Design a protein around this motif. Structure first.
Motif, PDB file in Angstrom:
ATOM      1  N   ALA A 261      19.655  83.207  11.006  1.00  0.00           N
ATOM      2  CA  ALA A 261      20.128  82.741   9.734  1.00  0.00           C
ATOM      3  C   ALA A 261      19.597  81.349   9.584  1.00  0.00           C
ATOM      4  CB  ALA A 261      21.665  82.629   9.674  1.00  0.00           C
ATOM      5  N   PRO A 262      19.379  80.841   8.377  1.00  0.00           N
ATOM      6  CA  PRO A 262      19.107  79.437   8.143  1.00  0.00           C
ATOM      7  C   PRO A 262      20.382  78.645   8.258  1.00  0.00           C
ATOM      8  CG  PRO A 262      19.111  80.615   6.028  1.00  0.00           C
ATOM      9  CD  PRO A 262      19.269  81.636   7.153  1.00  0.00           C
ATOM     10  N   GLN A 263      20.255  77.365   8.692  1.00  0.00           N
ATOM     11  CA  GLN A 263      21.309  76.403   8.932  1.00  0.00           C
ATOM     12  C   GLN A 263      22.311  76.287   7.812  1.00  0.00           C
ATOM     13  OE1 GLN A 263      22.240  74.969  11.755  1.00  0.00           O
ATOM     14  NE2 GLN A 263      24.016  74.057  10.638  1.00  0.00           N
ATOM     15  N   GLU A 264      21.845  76.368   6.541  1.00  0.00           N
ATOM     16  CA  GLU A 264      22.625  76.445   5.318  1.00  0.00           C
ATOM     17  C   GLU A 264      23.857  77.333   5.363  1.00  0.00           C
ATOM     18  OE1 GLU A 264      20.500  78.180   1.771  1.00  0.00           O
ATOM     19  OE2 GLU A 264      18.880  78.434   3.272  1.00  0.00           O
ATOM     20  N   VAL A 265      23.798  78.480   6.088  1.00  0.00           N
ATOM     21  CA  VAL A 265      24.852  79.469   6.112  1.00  0.00           C
ATOM     22  C   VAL A 265      25.710  79.173   7.309  1.00  0.00           C
ATOM     23  CG1 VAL A 265      25.490  81.908   6.048  1.00  0.00           C
ATOM     24  CG2 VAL A 265      23.217  81.149   5.227  1.00  0.00           C
TER      25      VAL A 265
ATOM     26  N   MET B 238      15.884  81.521   9.786  1.00  0.00           N
ATOM     27  CA  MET B 238      15.288  80.362  10.501  1.00  0.00           C
ATOM     28  C   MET B 238      15.154  80.722  11.949  1.00  0.00           C
ATOM     29  SD  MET B 238      16.853  76.430  10.873  1.00  0.00           S
ATOM     30  CE  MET B 238      16.894  76.122   9.083  1.00  0.00           C
ATOM     31  N   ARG B 239      16.159  80.344  12.773  1.00  0.00           N
ATOM     32  CA  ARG B 239      16.144  80.520  14.198  1.00  0.00           C
ATOM     33  C   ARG B 239      17.347  81.351  14.518  1.00  0.00           C
ATOM     34  NH1 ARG B 239      17.698  74.045  15.216  1.00  0.00           N
ATOM     35  NH2 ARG B 239      16.106  73.920  13.485  1.00  0.00           N
ATOM     36  N   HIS B 240      17.404  81.884  15.764  1.00  0.00           N
ATOM     37  CA  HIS B 240      18.547  82.579  16.313  1.00  0.00           C
ATOM     38  C   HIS B 240      19.789  81.721  16.296  1.00  0.00           C
ATOM     39  CE1 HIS B 240      20.601  85.589  18.724  1.00  0.00           C
ATOM     40  NE2 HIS B 240      20.947  84.681  19.670  1.00  0.00           N
ATOM     41  N   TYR B 241      20.957  82.375  16.400  1.00  0.00           N
ATOM     42  CA  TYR B 241      22.252  81.761  16.392  1.00  0.00           C
ATOM     43  C   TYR B 241      23.108  82.835  16.985  1.00  0.00           C
ATOM     44  CZ  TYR B 241      20.909  77.769  13.606  1.00  0.00           C
ATOM     45  OH  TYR B 241      20.245  76.593  13.187  1.00  0.00           O
TER      46      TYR B 241
ATOM     47  N   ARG C 141      39.554  78.478  18.980  1.00  0.00           N
ATOM     48  CA  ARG C 141      38.339  77.749  19.250  1.00  0.00           C
ATOM     49  C   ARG C 141      37.164  78.408  18.557  1.00  0.00           C
ATOM     50  NH1 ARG C 141      34.458  75.568  22.671  1.00  0.00           N
ATOM     51  NH2 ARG C 141      34.921  73.465  23.631  1.00  0.00           N
ATOM     52  N   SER C 142      35.954  77.835  18.738  1.00  0.00           N
ATOM     53  CA  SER C 142      34.740  78.364  18.181  1.00  0.00           C
ATOM     54  C   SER C 142      33.635  77.685  18.941  1.00  0.00           C
ATOM     55  CB  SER C 142      34.583  78.107  16.654  1.00  0.00           C
ATOM     56  OG  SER C 142      33.491  78.826  16.093  1.00  0.00           O
ATOM     57  N   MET C 143      32.438  78.304  18.911  1.00  0.00           N
ATOM     58  CA  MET C 143      31.272  77.874  19.630  1.00  0.00           C
ATOM     59  C   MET C 143      30.151  78.598  18.934  1.00  0.00           C
ATOM     60  SD  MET C 143      30.273  77.875  23.800  1.00  0.00           S
ATOM     61  CE  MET C 143      31.724  76.881  24.243  1.00  0.00           C
ATOM     62  N   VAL C 144      28.902  78.171  19.180  1.00  0.00           N
ATOM     63  CA  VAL C 144      27.738  78.811  18.647  1.00  0.00           C
ATOM     64  C   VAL C 144      26.651  78.346  19.565  1.00  0.00           C
ATOM     65  CG1 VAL C 144      27.543  77.016  16.854  1.00  0.00           C
ATOM     66  CG2 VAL C 144      26.138  79.153  16.701  1.00  0.00           C
ATOM     67  N   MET C 145      25.716  79.257  19.909  1.00  0.00           N
ATOM     68  CA  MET C 145      24.560  78.960  20.712  1.00  0.00           C
ATOM     69  C   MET C 145      23.422  79.391  19.849  1.00  0.00           C
ATOM     70  SD  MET C 145      26.070  77.694  23.318  1.00  0.00           S
ATOM     71  CE  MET C 145      24.533  77.252  24.182  1.00  0.00           C
ATOM     72  N   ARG C 146      22.176  79.090  20.257  1.00  0.00           N
ATOM     73  CA  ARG C 146      21.051  79.310  19.390  1.00  0.00           C
ATOM     74  C   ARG C 146      19.821  79.376  20.233  1.00  0.00           C
ATOM     75  NH1 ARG C 146      19.785  74.437  21.962  1.00  0.00           N
ATOM     76  NH2 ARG C 146      21.011  72.663  21.004  1.00  0.00           N
ATOM     77  N   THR C 147      18.692  79.747  19.574  1.00  0.00           N
ATOM     78  CA  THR C 147      17.356  79.905  20.110  1.00  0.00           C
ATOM     79  C   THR C 147      17.313  80.793  21.336  1.00  0.00           C
ATOM     80  OG1 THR C 147      17.207  77.730  21.249  1.00  0.00           O
ATOM     81  CG2 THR C 147      16.559  77.857  18.923  1.00  0.00           C
ATOM     82  N   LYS C 148      16.268  80.615  22.184  1.00  0.00           N
ATOM     83  CA  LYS C 148      16.095  81.265  23.462  1.00  0.00           C
ATOM     84  C   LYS C 148      15.921  82.746  23.279  1.00  0.00           C
ATOM     85  CE  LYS C 148      19.233  77.770  25.580  1.00  0.00           C
ATOM     86  NZ  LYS C 148      19.787  77.362  24.266  1.00  0.00           N
TER      87      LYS C 148
END
Lengths: 166, 74, 70, 135, 128, 88
Positions: free
Chosen positions: D66-70, D1-4, D86-93
């Motif tokens: 990856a698609p959001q599903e995963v 899908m989009r970046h992650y 902790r955990s974090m995730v950024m996406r797109t750009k």
RNA sequence: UCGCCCCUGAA
RNA sequence: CUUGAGUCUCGUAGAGGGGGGUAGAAUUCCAGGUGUAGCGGUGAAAUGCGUAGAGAUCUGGAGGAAUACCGGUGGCGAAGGCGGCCCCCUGGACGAAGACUGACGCUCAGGUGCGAAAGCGUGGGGAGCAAACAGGAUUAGAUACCCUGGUAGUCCACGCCGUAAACGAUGUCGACUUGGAGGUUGUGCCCUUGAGGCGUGGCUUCCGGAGCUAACGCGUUAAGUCGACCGCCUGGGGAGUAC
């Protein structure tokens, strides 16, 4: 401005006359103030506000200042040549021209101001709060502001010349 | 010559950089108060656009415990 | 009124009144009073009212500066 | 899908687990019509303040499409892993795989001007292959 | 001045270092020297010095209290301060300076001060 | 939301031709497609006031265009309705 | 900062 | 037909909306440690709290509420309004080339939707603050401001009521009319050789010309100059009350 009180044709007249006050540090003072107009029966009319400790010098000084607030007006017949329905100050002013065979028809300031100014067959009206003091602003709204036949005629004549020039 | 189509600077002594700001311990620590606070923009002299870009980066990195936010209890 | 940064040199009086300006600004004086959203925001617009007026003052000042009357 | 761009904090003494942990994730991503752009790391940097106690914490990064599903299942793991802090995730750009401050830290390590540890550099190269081996 | 003297029964809790806590309150001044093991050694305050009113926060009142406190930690043998200035009222260098001038020196300036992120709501207080 | 992919599908189906680039038919079509699945975006939420307002504007717009369509060509208007699910 | 009210009319 | 309007494409920025996760600071409770006669409050005081060991200070644990700084006439939304961080779903705005539709538009009584805060019903939650309430103080009196406590409530979920100096005291839409400086956000151009130099759009402050106004002032984002449609007013008290 220039004199509106001129020998052999002067037409001295008065408008308002009253007292006003300031509250001084001690008591309260009275300043003898008044409005005037001198005409000529041919236009040339103004107004002044004197300040004096007496009624005679209130009218003295106001007729001095009348000459210093002279406005020119020129007309034909005994009536104004153009209607002016303009309003200056909160006193509302209206002014029609009218055919000869009718009076001034006005009891206010514009009875006397529309006498001295060479007119006396004019019909006028006013609405709003009663207050002679700014009925006098029909100097602005009829005598100062006007149209005349030869003014409008030179609109029609100006245009012709431009077409020829190109 | 002509049509080279960009500037050679975007740096100043009171105006920030452009086009990339991202979390990383090193870089960010220079643009924040020593007490774990973030700088005011009226001192630094940065314009809005610089400030917004920096802010984002700062806060993310900060809550990954790379920049301090405990200094009142440290 | 102080910051976590230390002074390790001999002093009796040290600089800590501009560590006051690296901490306090009335932010320990807002703990005994409640305000609306209206109150402090209008006050911020009197410190940018200062800054626009600063330019305007200079034109007025320039006339006074010509003459000596001090 | 989009970046992650999953950045998370592992336990600093379970840092040897990291390659294997990554491998389990990355494999599933690729299989779901994703791609691994590059695996990156940031080692056992000393924490600014305690998050779940500790005097230091392990950090790690991921650049993945990856698609959001995963991304769902990945988040689930972390929020039920007590090894993961902790955990974090950024996406797109686009992707921040190259030419970003996170990358700048990595470049120093390879040149041996290390931001944190010689070991940390090696792990990034391993992950990109997807032939990872525990530290 | 008029401040009491103090003394302690222990001389076995020293580590030659201790936190100089100062709470410069608008209505009082507390000075407490705790050890660097995080266990009290001495304490003193303006009201115990004998001050009343809003003259418990004054510079003078802060000094007297800093020195009352000094008597309560001298017997352990302490000569380093980890100054923790807090509270908004005066007495914030009055205490520091007094300690220096009392056979101690500063070694650390630290900030432990309550700064809320508004997890509690302020009172109104005075309005007369 | 409407993907650029989903856009192009609707453009190819509706309108006089394909690659119309926004014609009366296609305009109404696009709106319809959005609205239908944003019903389910307020079936997962209660009040969501700004987004709700957005939906209402799209419904209104869809009707406006339709009104011109019956005044341009009855046949066209009737046809479009059959292919769509919204027509109220 | 020390609370604190009350005052028929035309010169 | 395209100038109005709308769509398409590509980007741009933002506390727009809704939902779910997550971090630390601070206050509080509880537990443990240390230390002793005060603490707290105030203009002075007192009530209250302390040898049954408080206050402070340190360590451990728990909970609720809110997110210091950031931060600014800064930004976004139709308005109300909206601030730590992250993900998901989703709305609006604007600009740029073009491309297309072809007046499809504007406004609007009724009608319909959205409503700060308080309030109400139902179920959760409860740290701090705080109507009520109780002592104390000030006062002649003080059912208050002031001080020490403190309940409903504030908080969360859902529904309801729909008000506010719901404000720019400025209906909405379209059209025009000197300018100057700042702020903010796109985009074109210029040894881009200068963070920028010159444009041109969107939004936002301050100043002010003409004009308008009774004046204060408003002043291209108008209270200027016009049109379109709607809403309202028609002396005050009586009364936003009665029926």
């Amino acid at each position: 401005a220039h004199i509106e009180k001129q020998a052999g044709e002067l037409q001295e007249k008065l408008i308002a006359v009253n007292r006003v006050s300031k509250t001084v540090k001690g008591g309260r003072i009275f300043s003898f103030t008044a409005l005037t107009v001198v005409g000529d029966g041919n236009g040339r009319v103004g107004f002044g506000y004197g300040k004096a400790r007496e009624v005679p010098a209130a009218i003295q000084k106001a007729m001095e200042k009348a000459r210093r607030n002279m406005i020119n007006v020129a007309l034909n017949n005994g009536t104004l040549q153009h209607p002016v329905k303009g309003v200056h100050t909160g006193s509302r002013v209206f002014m029609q021209p009218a055919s000869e065979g009718t009076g001034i028809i006005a009891g206010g300031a514009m009875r006397a101001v529309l006498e001295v100014a060479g007119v006396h067959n004019v019909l006028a009206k006013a609405y709003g709060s009663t207050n002679p003091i700014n009925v006098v602003r029909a100097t602005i709204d009829g005598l100062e502001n006007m149209n005349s036949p030869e003014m409008v005629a030179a609109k029609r004549g100006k245009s012709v010349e431009e077409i020829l020039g190109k | 010559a002509r049509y080279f189509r960009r500037r050679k600077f975007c740096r100043f002594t009171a105006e920030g950089v452009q086009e990339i700001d991202y979390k990383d311990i090193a870089t960010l620590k220079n643009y924040i108060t020593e007490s774990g606070k973030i700088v005011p923009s009226r001192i630094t002299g940065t314009r809005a656009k610089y400030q917004r870009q920096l802010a984002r980066a700062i806060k993310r990195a900060r809550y990954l415990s790379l920049l301090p936010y405990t200094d009142r209890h440290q | 009124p102080v910051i976590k940064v230390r002074e390790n040199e001999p002093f009796d009086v040290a600089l800590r009144r501009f560590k006051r300006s690296c901490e306090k600004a009335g932010v320990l004086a807002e703990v005994r009073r409640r305000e609306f959203y209206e109150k402090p925001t209008t006050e911020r617009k009197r410190a940018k009212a200062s800054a626009v007026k600063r330019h305007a003052k200079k034109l007025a000042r320039e006339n006074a500066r010509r003459t000596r009357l001090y | 899908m989009r970046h992650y761009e999953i950045v998370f904090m592992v336990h600093p003494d379970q840092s040897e687990q990291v390659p294997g942990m990554i491998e389990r994730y990355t494999a599933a991503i690729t299989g779901a019509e994703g791609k691994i752009h590059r695996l990156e790391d940031w080692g056992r940097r000393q924490l600014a303040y305690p998050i779940n106690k500790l005097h230091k914490a392990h950090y790690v990064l991921m650049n993945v499409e990856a698609p959001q599903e995963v991304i769902d299942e990945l988040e689930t793991t972390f929020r039920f892993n007590d090894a993961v802090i902790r955990s974090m995730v950024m996406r797109t750009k686009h992707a921040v795989t190259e030419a970003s401050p996170m990358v700048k830290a990595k470049d120093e390590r390879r040149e041996r001007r290390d931001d944190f540890a010689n070991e940390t550099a090696d792990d990034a190269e391993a992950g990109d292959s997807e032939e990872e081996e525990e530290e | 001045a008029k401040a009491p003297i103090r003394a302690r029964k222990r001389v076995r809790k020293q580590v030659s270092d201790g936190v100089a806590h100062i709470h410069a309150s608008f209505n009082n001044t507390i000075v407490t020297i705790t050890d660097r093991q995080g266990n009290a050694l001495g304490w003193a305050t303006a009201g115990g010095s004998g001050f009343r009113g809003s003259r418990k926060s004054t510079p003078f009142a802060a000094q007297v209290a800093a020195e009352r406190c000094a008597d309560a930690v001298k017997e352990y043998g302490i000569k380093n301060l980890e100054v923790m200035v807090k509270g908004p009222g005066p007495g914030r260098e009055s205490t520091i300076r007094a300690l220096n001038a009392a056979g101690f020196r500063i070694t650390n300036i630290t900030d432990v001060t309550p700064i809320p992120h508004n997890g509690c709501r302020p009172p109104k207080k005075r309005r007369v | 939301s409407l993907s650029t992919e989903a856009t192009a599908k609707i453009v190819s189906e509706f309108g006089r031709d394909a690659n119309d680039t926004g014609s009366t038919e296609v305009q109404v079509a696009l709106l319809t497609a959005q609205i239908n699945h944003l019903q389910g975006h307020f079936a997962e939420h209660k009040k969501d006031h700004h987004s709700r307002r957005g939906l209402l504007r799209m419904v209104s717009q869809r009707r406006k265009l339709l009104d011109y369509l019956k005044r341009k060509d009855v046949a066209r208007y009737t046809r479009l309705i059959e292919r769509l699910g919204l027509r109220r």
